[PDB]
Amino acid sequence: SRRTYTLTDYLKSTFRVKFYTLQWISDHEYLYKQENNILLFNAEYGNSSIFLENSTFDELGYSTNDYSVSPDRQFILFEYNYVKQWRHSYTASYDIYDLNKRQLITEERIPNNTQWITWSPVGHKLAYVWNNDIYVKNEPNLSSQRITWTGKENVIYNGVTDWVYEEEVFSAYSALWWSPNGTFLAYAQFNDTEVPLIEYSFYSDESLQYPKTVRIPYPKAGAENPTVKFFVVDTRTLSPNASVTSYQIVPPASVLIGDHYLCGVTWVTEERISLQWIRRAQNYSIIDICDYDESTGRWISSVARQHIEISTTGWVGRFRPAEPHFTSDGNSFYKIISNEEGYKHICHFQTDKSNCTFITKGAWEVIGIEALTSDYLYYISNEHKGMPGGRNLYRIQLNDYTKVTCLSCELNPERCQYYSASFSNKAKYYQLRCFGPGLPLYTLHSSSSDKELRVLEDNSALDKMLQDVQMPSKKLDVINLHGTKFWYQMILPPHFDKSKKYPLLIEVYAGPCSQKVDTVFRLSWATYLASTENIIVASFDGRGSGYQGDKIMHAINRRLGTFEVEDQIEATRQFSKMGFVDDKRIAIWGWSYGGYVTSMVLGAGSGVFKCGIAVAPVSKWEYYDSVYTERYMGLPTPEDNLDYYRNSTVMSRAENFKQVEYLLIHGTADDNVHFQQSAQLSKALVDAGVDFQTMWYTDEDHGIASNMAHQHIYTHMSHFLKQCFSLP
Amino acid sequence: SRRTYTLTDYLKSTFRVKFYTLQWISDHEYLYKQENNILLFNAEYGNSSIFLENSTFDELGYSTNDYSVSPDRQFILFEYNYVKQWRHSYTASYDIYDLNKRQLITEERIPNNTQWITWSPVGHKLAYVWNNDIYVKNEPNLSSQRITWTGKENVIYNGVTDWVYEEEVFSAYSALWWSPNGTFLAYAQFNDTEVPLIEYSFYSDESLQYPKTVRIPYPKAGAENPTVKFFVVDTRTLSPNASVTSYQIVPPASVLIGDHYLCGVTWVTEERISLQWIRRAQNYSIIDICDYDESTGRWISSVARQHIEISTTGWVGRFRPAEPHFTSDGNSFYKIISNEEGYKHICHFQTDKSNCTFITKGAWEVIGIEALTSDYLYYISNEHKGMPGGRNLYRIQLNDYTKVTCLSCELNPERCQYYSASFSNKAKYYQLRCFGPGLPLYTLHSSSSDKELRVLEDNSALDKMLQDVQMPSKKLDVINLHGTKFWYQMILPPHFDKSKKYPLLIEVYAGPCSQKVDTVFRLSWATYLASTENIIVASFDGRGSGYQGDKIMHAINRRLGTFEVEDQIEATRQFSKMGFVDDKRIAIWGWSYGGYVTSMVLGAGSGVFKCGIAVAPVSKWEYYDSVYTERYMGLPTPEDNLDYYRNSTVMSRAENFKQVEYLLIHGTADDNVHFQQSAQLSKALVDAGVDFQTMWYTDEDHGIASNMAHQHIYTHMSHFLKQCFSLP
């Protein structure tokens, strides 16, 4: 050791962090890909048997990037020819392989350019989306039956989301939900007819003589939104000479009354489905539990089965309302909602009663419900040690809320404080995934006695490599702001010399319900900055941040660009007091919402920051999408919140940029935060006579994620920072 | 002490160079705007009188952008609501003011958004284009008569040029030509139905929620071109219930056979018109002189009145074939063409004979023919002192070509070496316009005696201001490359000390027929760089440059990006050996073709240049327009010149940029050299792992000309240069 973690190490991922991905297929069995082949591991004993030999991969077309085995284990889908679209959406080609006959299905194949495909929950039916229309295949070798005929590029989407539902509502491209036993196929249809189009140039390969213009129906704040229709198809009658039997379920009257969004769909039993709707304002949601009427095929709703959730001080949920988790019988459900104290906790609801009963409580929050059995409820929370940036698995007895045990807290306390879990079909077994503060660790456990069972991946290899590099140390702590304790973290350079003044880089996100301070282990750009360049990188979660109750999260309601920006400045000011920080060399950077906050901070005229870098920042809320923007800002009209939309633009702070060195970066093909945002920001700075630097990235999107652009952007930002900090 | 010429001096135009713009309206009178009053000057005796008092402008109620007086002096057109389109095109509102009854015409007004308007050459008829159609108004107070009905946005243009004809052929938006006595109105119709559209985003004011997509029919190299039709309208028959009497004149068969361009229109007499056409290849042009047949109304062509001009070593003319200058009777004409030695000289042609006689000859070139009488021909050439970068007015006796006199050469030999001239009707008087090397000097002269009559503007005001500043000096000289002498200029810092080593900035354009080395006086960014920052700024005209004969100019025929780039490197190499050049600090910069050459030089890997700045550069010829590109490069097909198109891209040299500091600048709304060119170049540099700097300019066009962007770009470039040269 006498070498550090370099920029090249980060960019080339020279130090590999291993993981362990598996797919549960029963209550005690899971599939795992080891050396290209799919093995069938038995959780209980660990006796692994080959389920699908490697080499059986004849590089069909390209390379199989994913597989899915039908529930009855008779077939397996091979996904290849992956073509990305937005954040979650993509199209791909699919091959169906018969596990019995061990033959490739060669007739009635899945179309090229398939948008979404899924096996039914039992058996082996298939439902897929192609050219915006839904198709169902009862048997892999049999021809598919067309379900919808209205699909139309950029207009009508059946079974898949449009741009805004994908990014802001579902966080998924799929909008198809098979019923438990495959009798019914539920789907949503999105109509973007009246949604304005964002248009931008895409240059493509150097050989393309004329650039292409990309057009996407994208509703900006206050614009016309897509409309949605939810249908339940009875697949029993699907036949070439038969029409489709379907029923449209509409939201309850209190939501149907105005613009709204469908935000959740949960099958309860084969004859009961739970739909969660939310008004466009997003401070009023309702769960509607509909029952199938065997005599008419209708799905009936009743006021007794409706559950309302509202927020008078903000929006419902973290990014959307939490999903209900029903009991096997469907007579009750558990769901995370805000406490009387503003903390998100699990409440128990009777399907036909309006009052619920909280089963957890405290100045901490449940992150999510992971599994439910007739006797226990497993959930993730940040209760342990009172640190909101930590995560642990817990089990609570359904007939005695006094009985709650933490399953992961003590397994490896110093190496593991941030966990996620994956349960087998009947919660009989669960994989624990520890992400930090130590090297990631994957383990298998049995719910019986919570026995450690075995280690799946401990990253021993990475550990060996790292003991030879001067790694920086990551510390978390708290600071007081306006009478409130907030968390921060600092990545400190190795062989830290307290007698020296180190330049400081604040990495910020700060969007509503964000969390930049946690105990997750990361080999990041910051690791390089601290290890090789001796720069301290700090992050702070202030007002508007999440997992600490609504009082803190809702503080920025209807006022984005205010308290979260001010808190970054105030916190940095506190950090600057430390004798080991060179207060004359403090920078700030961020991506997306973080680019916005970085810019707002730099335009605050605080005198605290010397320079900063904003990557793909929002610059004006009217330019961002309706769903996200309106959830936090209401509408941009004088009758509502136009005044706060107007004085929260970065452009309104243009003059103050004369005091700092600024680097504005943006991908020209960003379909999310449009290049427009940075183009308008640069124009305002030019108008104000302010000098600054820019870097556009041709054809890169919101992630500036291509291999060469990824390397180029961090290399460019690194040079900008060294220049700002007078570092050789 | 003494203040230097600062960046702010340049940016704010603190030092104002005055001029004297007049409009000849007869053989001895000219209008001149003075203190916003239009004055009428008599050259015969120097006396003047008020033509229009400025009180009139006060009464209009809008900012008058320009005015145009009818030839019979009874009316004046007032242009307002000016909205720029491309380099020459724009739209505007117009009022007609009756000078007799001194009242504004309020009836049958000219439509707003008018695209072009012009008085007839005699009287006061008006012809104008609105919504791509032509209208004629015999009287200011009378209703106009529509002439064409095919006008269609982005498809059919009547009376005005489409994008490429405006920029590359006519260097004007107008495509209408009244006959000498107003009998006929000729116009061209352009059809862009099959021309591909370039599309790019325009962001507009910050309040525009969604960007707009600008679309322009623009033929890039090898693409489908606009087609053209030429018509002569007989305006004597225009009447509300009369059809339009017109005749279409088609090109001669040697041009009609394939794609071609109309490149010139010259009215000879009321019954004779000269049309100049060129094949799409641009090395074959033909003049077709058509005569009006009074018995049928048609315009007749004859092989006897056709004159062919070709080029076997390159293209025809400098940027277009030179225009013919006809005698008053139309029986012969004078036109500049390349002679047997490859130098452009004046040839005398008989309208109905094929052979011509050269009246000028020598190792220098005639720039243009300025005026012609029955006895003399006046022209501008760079014959004096054999310096290609100088310009003087000569007069040649038509009956004895050996009798040639230089009218401007000895007027002010040290102050004035570069002149342009403007002759009155019948060439009785001329204004001489001296542009350098000293301060601009405008004088008036009598042709009968060649007496100087008077000084119109001598810039005494500016001269004074400049004595208190440390102005740099501009030196011109020659060097030998490959055995050919070429010219260069150096702008030298004040108190230039032969001993001291200075950083060097090469300012380059170097496109075909360019001339960056001349004796013109200029207050430029270079002036500031020399005066204040002590940087030597040099320019060099190498192979491909103009005004030095075809051997030099056509050297880069079919090979753009080769010799002109190599010559800039070689010249600079020689400069760095002059002892007063700090070879550790040599930079190069340019705009448009200059940005392309700057990039190619930086990508050459010569180790000569430390850094460079390309502004709105061409990066790949297939991205530029057909007319310009094909003129010098032919077609991008394997059958023609694809190979030289392929290895002349800036992207092909990306790897070599790792050795230099580069700044790429481009306006996002550049309709000429599309932003695409820099977007594809940056993408190739990113792919090659090259770090560099960028600066986009939102909504700026090829000129990056808005007041704020102009100040911003030079400020940004100065900082970059100073950082490259370690200048505080």
Ligand SMILES: *[C@@H]1O[C@H](CO)[C@@H](O[C@@H]2O[C@H](CO)[C@@H](O[C@@H]3O[C@H](CO)[C@@H](O)[C@H](O)[C@@H]3O)[C@H](O)[C@H]2NC(C)=O)[C@H](O)[C@H]1NC(C)=O
């Ligand atoms: C309308 O026209 C009248 C002329 O009848 C203009 O008046 C003239 O205005 C100019 C501009 O300021 C005056 O010139 C000045 O002369 C002094 C020389 O002592 C010089 O130092 C200044 O730089 C400038 O050149 C001129 O004396 C004056 N003439 C008269 C007759 O008063 C008037 O400006 C015009 N109005 C508008 C609003 O354009």
Ligand SMILES: *[C@@H]1O[C@H](CO)[C@@H](O[C@@H]2O[C@H](CO)[C@@H](O)[C@H](O)[C@H]2NC(C)=O)[C@H](O)[C@H]1NC(C)=O
């Ligand atoms: C998608 O939504 C649009 C409305 O935005 C629907 O268009 C309407 O269709 C009805 C019936 O054909 C017409 O009477 C209206 O005039 C249409 N309105 C507009 C603005 O076009 C369209 O039918 C919907 N498509 C689907 C399949 O649901």
Ligand SMILES: *[C@@H]1O[C@H](CO)[C@@H](O[C@@H]2O[C@H](CO)[C@@H](O)[C@H](O)[C@H]2NC(C)=O)[C@H](O)[C@H]1NC(C)=O
């Ligand atoms: C937009 O304007 C509001 C109202 O002027 C700003 O809120 C004030 O911020 C100051 C801090 O300078 C506080 O002292 C006041 O208490 C705030 N008043 C209100 C009504 O909350 C807000 O900060 C501005 N937003 C931005 C982005 O600058």
Ligand SMILES: *[C@@H]1O[C@H](CO)[C@@H](O[C@@H]2O[C@H](CO)[C@@H](O)[C@H](O)[C@H]2NC(C)=O)[C@H](O)[C@H]1NC(C)=O
């Ligand atoms: C494109 O390739 C051609 C052919 O190789 C280049 O032309 C040669 O240029 C070199 C360097 O000046 C000379 O030594 C050869 O005599 C040239 N050969 C020919 C066939 O002309 C040309 O320079 C290249 N163009 C660019 C911009 O790199």
Ligand SMILES: *[C@@H]1O[C@H](CO)[C@@H](O)[C@H](O)[C@H]1NC(C)=O
């Ligand atoms: C297939 O598995 C064997 C071990 O059973 C392994 O050695 C081989 O590399 C695998 N094939 C690959 C690399 O896909």
Ligand SMILES: *[C@@H]1O[C@H](CO)[C@@H](O)[C@H](O)[C@H]1NC(C)=O
């Ligand atoms: C594991 O071994 C048991 C016998 O102990 C056998 O029945 C089972 O099928 C095996 N499963 C796997 C996946 O190896």
Ligand SMILES: *[C@@H]1O[C@H](CO)[C@@H](O)[C@H](O)[C@H]1NC(C)=O
């Ligand atoms: C369905 O229609 C097709 C039409 O070609 C027919 O061949 C088939 O027999 C029909 N289904 C039955 C068997 O009723």
Ligand SMILES: *[C@@H]1O[C@H](CO)[C@@H](O)[C@H](O)[C@H]1NC(C)=O
């Ligand atoms: C929800 O927000 C809207 C503003 O868009 C407001 O009119 C309404 O009163 C809010 N409702 C609640 C429950 O706060």
Ligand SMILES: *[C@@H]1O[C@H](CO)[C@@H](O)[C@H](O)[C@H]1NC(C)=O
């Ligand atoms: C100049 O004087 C002549 C007479 O010598 C006269 O006709 C003419 O109109 C005058 N011009 C002006 C503008 O004063």
Ligand SMILES: *[C@@H]1O[C@H](CO)[C@@H](O)[C@H](O)[C@H]1NC(C)=O
């Ligand atoms: C323009 O050209 C198109 C073919 O490119 C032709 O069909 C059309 O008739 C022409 N229009 C006119 C008005 O000449």
Ligand SMILES: *[C@@H]1O[C@H](CO)[C@@H](O)[C@H](O)[C@H]1NC(C)=O
């Ligand atoms: C032209 O015809 C119209 C009738 O359509 C009539 O009003 C007008 O008087 C006519 N003008 C002429 C030139 O006779």
Ligand SMILES: *[C@@H]1O[C@H](CO)[C@@H](O)[C@H](O)[C@H]1NC(C)=O
């Ligand atoms: C004009 O150019 C064409 C195509 O580039 C070529 O075939 C022809 O030889 C040229 N004509 C002359 C006289 O050079």
